[PDB]
Subunit: 433 residues, 2 copies
Amino acid sequence: SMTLTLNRQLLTSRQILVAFSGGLDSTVLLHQLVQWRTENPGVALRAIHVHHGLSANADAWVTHCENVCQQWQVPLVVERVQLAQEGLGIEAQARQARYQAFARTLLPGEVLVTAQHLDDQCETFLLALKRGSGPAGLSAMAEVSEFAGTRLIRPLLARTRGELVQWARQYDLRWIEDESNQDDSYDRNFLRLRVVPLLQQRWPHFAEATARSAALCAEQESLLDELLADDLAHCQSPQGTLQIVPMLAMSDARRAAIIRRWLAGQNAPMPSRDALVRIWQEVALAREDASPCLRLGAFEIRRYQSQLWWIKSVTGQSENIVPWQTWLQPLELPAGLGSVQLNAGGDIRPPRADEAVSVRFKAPGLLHIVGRNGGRKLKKIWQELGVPPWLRDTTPLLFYGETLIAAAGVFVTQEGVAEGENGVSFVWQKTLS
Amino acid sequence: SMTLTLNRQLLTSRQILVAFSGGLDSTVLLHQLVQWRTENPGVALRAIHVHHGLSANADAWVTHCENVCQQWQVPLVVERVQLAQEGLGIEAQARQARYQAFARTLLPGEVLVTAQHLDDQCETFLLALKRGSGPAGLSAMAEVSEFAGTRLIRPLLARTRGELVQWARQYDLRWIEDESNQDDSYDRNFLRLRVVPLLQQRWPHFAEATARSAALCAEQESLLDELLADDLAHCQSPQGTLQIVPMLAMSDARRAAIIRRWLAGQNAPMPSRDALVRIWQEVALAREDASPCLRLGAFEIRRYQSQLWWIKSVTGQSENIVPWQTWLQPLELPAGLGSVQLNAGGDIRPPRADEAVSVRFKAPGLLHIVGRNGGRKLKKIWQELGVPPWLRDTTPLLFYGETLIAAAGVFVTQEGVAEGENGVSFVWQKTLS
């Protein structure tokens, strides 16, 4: 039935790439896939062993993987990524390097498949538990998730190590397995060896019961997904923000479940239940006048126009002034804001080779712009044009000497309009995400 | 703050009864209550030690409890309930006897209070987990629940054993504590001593994280409570049944959450997620023609009139015939169906001292009843009158010789109508629930 199970989960896939450590689970997953390939002509399969850290057999494991793949006619990428600096041990440092390694060496349209099984579901659950997470975090792992643009499928997720042993053995597969005892100071190890077994003693199927609970938590979260759909549709704008007004009346749990689901949409890192609390109390209910902001890692959620925004944090630049001596060539902007350049053809007057061109993010005094008869301050103009506060000091400002010419993609001052009709275009380019 | 916490949870209470084993938690809870009484004049407090099983100090513990209560001026009920027959050990047999003991010795209007703390929340969670239960069952314990008509409050539910030790010690309270090592074959013991501690090693606050998860599961179930309210109102009749038709269109999770919440309303034992599945697939979607029935312990859920019913199972009696030689005196019915009697005054003709009166639950041939011009079979009459199938063979039928006179509270045959106007009343009495 593991083969039966395999094809159902892999129907929507043609190109697979399996994380292949010499181990049982990988060995059983891979043998099954090579078994699967022989049954579906035209199906391409690739394997990838990730050699990381200074293991005693780190080099031998690689060799073992090269023989098995070849004996089975399967290409094999072998990333040697290395990283460890006294910080977060194996159960963190490496896991990232590995998934990055998977990300790196993964073709487009190819589906990443891992050999994570029941015991891992139990371990994930426990770790979530020891973190005091709710139903969302206790749903542990999904049979199908999104990873590096594509999907990450986990077939053997429901299978027991017993089942895997019974298979790997029935087909006389040879596999490695260095328990690495002394890694007991790294959470996921301390479980499989000490806690979990201790549990399987009086409760032989403990790990099975846990997947059951995980599954039930998931069913409930999806029930809420259904139940909240409308609420979400209404409060979620097309832009990708969340309308505050429609929520002012809701209950704390309602709000949190929505904020939660909304943050998931931006494919954001799962928030802590208290984070969800702060977001509403300190941001949504905060005065827009006082620029509300909750830092959540590299990202930040804030309030603007009675809406909550999930955006990639970026450091201000109001005090910066980046000179453009060679404005004939693009100018690289600070804090990865991208490049900027003056192309022939546009409503902005070119600079004289005698004046000093520069890029800034601030501009004093009353300012006059095209399309408005008046003259207000930068901040007033920003507001009238709807430019969000986090962008009011991160938007390129063209300056010839001490004069403001334009604000990339937002406006052009009147003192900067093309005299004749020729003129140039101040163009702003941002790097890939 | 434990005192602060105490009064908030006990405001809606005047008469308390604390399950008092000599232990820390009880000792700390009780001392705090005697502390609480001194601060709220007119507040009555009672303690109850439950002596059960053949413990080495079973008798000494009692004595210790008698001294402490007296030293503190607190009445003390001491139930000696005993029960153990090789079946379900302490973590089952006794727990029932104890709560029964609590039930028995509890005054009306009095609130039962127990000294269950954080560690118990963790243990309850784990047990639920090892049972593979979902969010509803993983909410573990509530600060306030219903027990024997009244409420069961658990103040110290959030407090750590540490906190309790720090208190019992700060007020120099003396308490007992016989770990009873060899009870390790009884689930809740195997946890507190082996698993939990093993966990608190690498995770000192594991038990605290677990209450956090329990709490979050609860918040979500209440979120659903809110979200499903309307659905429940609509599908739940006034009688206390569940309308099937309005659910036919819903999704599996929706239905289950409703069936679940509905069963809770009848204050029924929490159902297994699969039970919820069977109920719908085997009962709701079953043909009423084929009398659908799912036995869930002493109770059973069934289908009648496009509705699901939660009712106290009762064995049929269609084959039974209980003679009434002394119809002048009440007749005790089988299978705790209650008693039955003929009172002077009613539309039924009395029996002659020459005919043989009896009670039955079946009746052959075409039958003629008052208020209908015709003559159909018992089963047809039952149907036309709306008598549920489980009651069609558990309803007393008056028989003089071989003639049907009446069906208690349902109908009177035409051959049994009072000749003149005097007549008697066939009255059916059922015992307390």
